[PDB]
Design a protein around this ligand. Structure first.
Ligand SMILES: *[C@@H]1O[C@H](CO)[C@@H](O)[C@H](O)[C@H]1NC(C)=O
Ligand SMILES: *[C@@H]1O[C@H](CO)[C@@H](O)[C@H](O)[C@H]1NC(C)=O
Length: 231
């Protein structure tokens, strides 16, 4: 069995550079399944789609494999940076001339739904996961400030008939517990990329979420002992 990962610098091997790492690098150790980390720094649901990266996974996935999809950090606005999705949750389309093409730009849920349907057709088990939080201790006071993309991932899961993991909430829960000095130490570059220790915390919070939510992936866990509490 193989688990394919789609995401951005918070998930990717080597993170955002300069010493950081992504959470997808801290899963293999706890799964009986091979992990293929196809996350890439800087990508949004739109640009990951446009770059053919969901299609790349689709073309190698085998029946019974899993695909975990987690975007949002790069999906918001600000002229066309090649990443911003069209606003909304449905069938809205936005047109933009980007890299010499009049591009048809979809909403964040449509991109996720379309990828999910593609993987389901190939026999894969798709897990849509809400984005991780930017450092919630940046101000010295804990702030839980979900982006619109958190619930949009849940919406997408429901429309596509696939599983949802609220990775956001499990990360912010353990960050609240770990506290100000510890969590600030996980963000040496900007408030998004994580140090290796933070990437591991973030991965362990995904695994906690799987145990607590009863996600299908629990079947390939080799332990259920992860820090934090069920939410
Ligand atoms: C882009 O394509 C759409 C859909 O056909 C069309 O309305 C729009 O005018 C085109 N835009 C540009 C700037 O060519
Ligand atoms: C929070 O942690 C940062 C980094 O160690 C520290 O510089 C700041 O003073 C701490 N904030 C307070 C409110 O303790």
């Amino acid at each position: 069995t193989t688990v394919y990962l789609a995401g951005d610098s918070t998930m990717a091997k080597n993170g955002g550079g300069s010493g950081t790492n992504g959470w997808g690098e801290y899963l293999a150790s706890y799964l009986s399944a091979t992990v293929v980390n196809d996350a890439v720094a800087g990508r949004s649901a739109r640009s990951y789609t446009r770059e053919g990266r969901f299609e790349n996974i689709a073309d190698v996935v085998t029946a019974g494999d899993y695909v975990i999809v987690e975007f949002g950090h790069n999906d918001g606005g600000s002229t066309d940076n090649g990443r911003t999705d069209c606003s909304g949750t449905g069938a809205e389309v936005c047109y933009s001339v980007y890299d010499g093409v009049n591009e048809t730009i979809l909403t964040f849920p449509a991109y996720l739904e379309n990828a999910a349907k593609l993987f389901t057709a190939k026999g894969a088990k798709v897990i849509l996961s809400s984005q991780t939080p930017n450092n919630p201790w940046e101000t010295g006071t804990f702030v839980n400030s979900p982006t619109r993309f958190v619930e949009y991932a849940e919406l997408a899961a429901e429309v596509a008939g696939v599983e949802y993991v609220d990775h956001w909430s499990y990360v912010d829960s353990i960050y609240e517990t770990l506290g100000n000095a510890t969590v600030n130490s996980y963000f040496p570059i900007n408030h998004t990329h994580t140090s290796p220790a933070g990437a591991e915390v973030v991965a362990e919070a995904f695994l906690k979420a799987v145990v607590c939510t009863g996600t299908s992936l629990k079947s390939v866990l080799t332990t259920t002992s992860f820090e934090g509490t069920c939410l």
